[PDB]
Design an enzyme around this catalytic site. Structure first.
Site, PDB file in Angstrom:
ATOM      1  N   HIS A   1      52.735 -25.359  -9.560  1.00 10.91           N
ATOM      2  CA  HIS A   1      53.544 -24.619  -8.586  1.00 10.91           C
ATOM      3  C   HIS A   1      54.546 -23.634  -9.201  1.00 10.91           C
ATOM      4  CE1 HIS A   1      52.507 -26.552  -4.695  1.00 10.91           C
ATOM      5  NE2 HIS A   1      52.053 -27.501  -5.496  1.00 10.91           N
TER       6      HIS A   1
ATOM      7  N   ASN B   1      46.681 -33.013  -8.168  1.00 11.38           N
ATOM      8  CA  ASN B   1      47.136 -33.027  -6.796  1.00 11.38           C
ATOM      9  C   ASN B   1      46.301 -33.913  -5.878  1.00 11.38           C
ATOM     10  OD1 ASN B   1      48.826 -32.078  -4.573  1.00 11.38           O
ATOM     11  ND2 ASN B   1      46.859 -31.224  -3.865  1.00 11.38           N
TER      12      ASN B   1
ATOM     13  N   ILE C   1      48.567 -26.147  -1.725  1.00 13.85           N
ATOM     14  CA  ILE C   1      49.203 -27.243  -0.996  1.00 13.85           C
ATOM     15  C   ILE C   1      49.975 -28.100  -1.988  1.00 13.85           C
ATOM     16  CG2 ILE C   1      47.255 -28.898  -1.135  1.00 13.85           C
ATOM     17  CD1 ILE C   1      49.660 -28.267   1.874  1.00 13.85           C
TER      18      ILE C   1
ATOM     19  N   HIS D   1      45.599 -27.851 -11.194  1.00 15.38           N
ATOM     20  CA  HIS D   1      46.302 -28.279  -9.998  1.00 15.38           C
ATOM     21  C   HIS D   1      45.474 -29.281  -9.204  1.00 15.38           C
ATOM     22  CE1 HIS D   1      47.346 -27.910  -5.652  1.00 15.38           C
ATOM     23  NE2 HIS D   1      48.512 -28.266  -6.163  1.00 15.38           N
TER      24      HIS D   1
ATOM     25  N   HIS E   1      52.803 -31.844 -12.004  1.00 12.95           N
ATOM     26  CA  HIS E   1      52.487 -31.156 -10.759  1.00 12.95           C
ATOM     27  C   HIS E   1      53.455 -29.992 -10.544  1.00 12.95           C
ATOM     28  CE1 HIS E   1      52.720 -30.847  -6.234  1.00 12.95           C
ATOM     29  NE2 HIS E   1      51.527 -30.373  -6.549  1.00 12.95           N
TER      30      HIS E   1
HETATM   31 FE   LIG Z   1      50.415 -29.007  -5.113  1.00 16.31          FE
END
Ligand SMILES: [Fe+3]
Length: 819
Positions: free
Chosen positions: A484, A674, A819, A670, A479
């Site tokens: 990110h 996520n 997010i 992602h 992750h």
């Molecule tokens: Fe995330």
């Protein structure tokens, strides 16, 4: 000769989480800029200061919070055709500019400007704000009178590498991860610099420029707000959609409140039975009134729990228990989640036995696996048969975790093993775990499956140690690092080097929405010293540093889905298949659904690029594109710049590959890692984040407890109750779709380009995603695929369904890392 225009804007009060007539008069000026007539210096001529004339209430296309204003420009025969404009806000308050539309005799002659930018008081800007019409140009196609404007706006966005960044700045630049420690508060909160060295390589992040701490000139001082360039924090109409604010509130308000409840002995400090954990989503947890009253007023936070306003907080029931309360405990589900769970992309094929370690034997001794082939129950296969038929697989965390086990285990309340898990692909197409190896450095036991007796509890605990490894790897590597952190340098480089006019800017920027914003808030509250991750996951102060060790081996081109599958030995190249790979685990839900999404994005990119680049020559000769990619590699991922696998970007095929990978990481990759976090991990026994002790030794009370009370032995081993409450709250936030999300196949404005061919290609992309969604629905209803797509938890694998409504839905692919 007057041109009628309509300005659409949102006043500040509509987009905050915490009068229109004032816009009239001489408070907002616009000046049109010619695309076809130049002054003596070759720059497009500029018109007169023109002011907003009146409110336009009779406009049906207005969205919520939006206001329209009429304007009338005087534009004679000497001025040519407009292609840009200046805006000067003389008011004391910023507003969010959406659009300017210029009317023409014919509806085909309408000129559209898509702005979507905050406009601050003119005195705060070094140079006047400029906006371009929605025509797409590679640099060599820019109308001559706009060239200098195009080039100067890019210069504005780059800044000069110095200065403290302020709220209204739009300056994009790079810095290292030197802002996570807090040495000026406590020496124990010092953290290594990550990036800019071969010992600690790392992707760069957005520069903030607050300057050094007093106790360390290399660490950046703390700030109340972590800057991002202004338009990377666009705002939301509804406060409950400002999910990214939640981690800050959790760390600064909620966590201290929970901690006080435990210090005061107001609730048991530990879970004592599995029912104590199930209670969290059934009857709730009872807390003191002053703790409840502190939490429930907070925006975003209050949406996470149901409460009676007095003593009860109740969490939502996680998907993984919605049908069966116990199925998470089965070996079948343990194995299934490696191909269809929150972290589906770590398992590897075995081609040799026993597995080997590459660890330096001078430091770690012999690390050859101690698992013997003859101890394994392979449903009647011999090892030679199972290897030759490519039925053996593993989840191998040995070499990743071993270098840190000694340091982790010196913490007062962490104890961990470095684990391997051996998997066998049964004739019915499901995976069977057949052995777990638990290793410690100088120390290595093999645990085999058992269903009865104390050995069945030892096997249950062995699975927990594996999933502590996996949970830590998932959060920090699959992750945080791979999505990110890896993406942020490409965001920065794009704004610095590709004009808003540029075709590849328009292709990629939807896939960056909210990325810098959530990352900056994460540096402040999630991955900081004593932040959420350090106080909820096993490795404590070593958590982020561990991801730096893994980044040493990160390979951009191996992030492509087919490459990843082949590398991990879970597929083979096969040109006679649609996607060019054969899945050795044919039913593998993440990979089989992912390949459909991959192919759809590929078709979109391969249909958009040739609209703007006819020949390899056109890629080489695009100066913005060449500067963009050079900076993204040499600065943004600069600790890896020397690696031979970076594409050179000298061909059409390289440009497609680069864009495809970027879009894949930001959207489907992602999403897959996520949005299943609370659905699978909302039950802490299924996805423990930490372990606190090693296996009981025979003849001790802890061993006796294991015999007489396996639930207490399990709960004493995994994440404690207080960090469980925190970690659940933060993965509930992360698993929630905001109502203003923009999903794959959508864009925020239908007029993002004037090029009808690009618009038609994008329409085709969205139609194909709807066809794929129907295909994936059919897969989940196919009884032949139930074993891997639903499992004993009866939870259909919907994480790569492209569409979703708002909320905690276990489906839907956003455009970006939002997010
Ligand atoms: Fe995330």
């Amino acid at each position: 000769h007057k041109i009628k225009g309509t300005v659409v804007l949102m006043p500040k009060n509509e987009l905050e989480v915490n009068n229109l007539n004032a816009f009239l008069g001489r408070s907002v000026s616009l000046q049109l800029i010619s695309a076809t007539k130049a002054d003596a210096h070759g720059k497009g001529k500029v018109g007169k200061d023109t002011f907003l004339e009146g409110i336009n209430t009779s406009l049906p296309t207005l969205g919520a919070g939006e206001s329209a204003f009429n304007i009338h420009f005087e534009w004679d025969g000497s001025m040519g055709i407009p292609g840009a404009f200046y805006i000067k806000n003389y008011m004391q308050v910023e507003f969010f500019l959406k659009s300017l539309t210029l009317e023409a005799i014919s509806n085909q002659g309408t000129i559209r400007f898509v702005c979507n930018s905050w406009v601050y008081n003119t005195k705060l800007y070094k140079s006047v704000r400029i906006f371009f019409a929605n025509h797409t140009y590679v640099p060599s196609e820019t109308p001559a009178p706009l060239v200098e404007y195009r080039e100067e706006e890019l210069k504005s966005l780059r800044g000069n590498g110095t200065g403290e960044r302020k709220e209204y700045d739009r300056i994009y630049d790079y810095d290292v991860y030197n802002d996570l420690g807090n040495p000026d508060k406590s020496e124990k909160l010092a953290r290594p610099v990550l990036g800019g060295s071969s010992t600690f390589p790392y992707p760069r992040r957005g520069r903030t420029g607050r300057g050094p701490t007093v106790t360390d000139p290399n660490t950046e001082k703390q700030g109340e707000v972590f800057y991002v360039p202004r338009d990377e924090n666009l705002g939301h109409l509804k406060s409950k959609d400002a999910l990214e604010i939640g981690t800050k509130s959790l760390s600064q308000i909620v966590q201290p409140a929970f901690e006080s409840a435990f210090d005061l002995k107001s609730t048991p400090i530990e879970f004592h039975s599995f029912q104590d954990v199930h209670d969290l989503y059934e009857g709730g947890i009872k807390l003191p009134r002053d703790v409840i009253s502190t939490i429930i007023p907070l925006p975003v936070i209050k949406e996470l729990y149901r409460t009676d306003g007095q003593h009860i907080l109740k969490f939502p029931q996680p998907h993984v228990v919605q049908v069966s309360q116990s199925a998470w405990m089965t070996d079948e589900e343990f194995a299934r989640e490696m191909i269809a769970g929150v972290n589906p992309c770590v398992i590897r094929g075995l081609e040799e036995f026993p597995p080997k370690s590459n660890l330096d034997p001078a430091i770690y001794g012999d690390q050859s696996s101690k698992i013997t082939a003859d101890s394994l129950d392979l449903d009647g296969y011999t090892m030679d048969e199972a290897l030759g038929s490519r039925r053996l697989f593993m989840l191998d965390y040995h070499d990743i975790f071993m270098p840190y086990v000694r340091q982790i285990n010196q913490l007062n309340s962490a104890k961990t093993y470095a684990t391997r898990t051996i998997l066998f692909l049964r004739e019915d197409g499901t995976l069977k775990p057949v052995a777990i190896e638990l290793s410690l450095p100088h120390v290595s036991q093999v645990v085999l499956p058992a269903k009865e007796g104390v050995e069945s509890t030892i096997w249950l605990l062995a699975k927990a140690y594996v999933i502590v490894n996996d949970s830590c790897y998932h959060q920090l590597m699959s992750h945080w690092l791979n999505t990110h952190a890896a993406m942020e340098p490409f965001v920065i480089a794009t704004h610095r080097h590709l004009s808003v006019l540029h075709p590849i800017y328009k292709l990629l920027t939807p896939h960056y929405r909210n990325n810098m914003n959530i990352n900056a808030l994460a540096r402040q509250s999630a991955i900081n010293a004593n932040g959420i991750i350090e106080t909820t996951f096993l490795p404590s102060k070593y958590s982020v540093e561990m991801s730096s060790a893994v980044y040493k081996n990160w390979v951009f081109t191996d992030q492509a889905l087919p490459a990843d599958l082949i590398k991990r030995g879970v597929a083979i190249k096969d040109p006679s298949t649609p996607h060019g790979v054969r899945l050795l685990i044919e039913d593998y839900p993440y990979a089989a659904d992912g390949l459909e999404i991959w192919a759809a994005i590929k078709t979109w990119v391969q249909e958009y690029v040739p609209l703007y680049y006819a020949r390899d020559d056109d890629v080489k000769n695009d100066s913005e594109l060449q500067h963009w990619w050079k900076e993204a590699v040499e600065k943004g991922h600069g600790d890896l710049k020397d690696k031979p696998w970076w594409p050179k970007l000298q061909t059409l095929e390289d440009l497609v590959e680069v864009c495809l990978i970027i879009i894949w990481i930001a959207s489907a990759l992602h999403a897959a890692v996520n949005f299943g976090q609370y659905p699978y991990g909302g039950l802490i026994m299924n996805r423990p984040t930490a372990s606190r002790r090693l296996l009981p030794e025979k003849g001790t009370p802890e061993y006796e407890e294991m015999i007489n009370n396996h639930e207490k032995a399990y709960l004493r081993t995994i994440t404690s109750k207080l960090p469980t409450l925190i970690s659940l709250s933060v993965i509930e936030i992360a698993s929630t779709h905001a109502s203003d999300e923009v999903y794959l196949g959508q864009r925020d404005n239908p007029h993002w380009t004037s090029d009808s061919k690009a618009l038609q290609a994008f329409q085709k992309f969205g139609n194909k995603l709807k066809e794929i969604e129907e295909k994936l629905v059919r897969r989940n209803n196919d009884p032949s695929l139930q074993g891997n797509r639903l499992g004993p938890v009866q939870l259909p694998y919907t994480l790569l369904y492209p569409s979703s409504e708002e909320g905690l839905t276990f489906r839907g692919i956003p455009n970006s890392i939002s997010i």
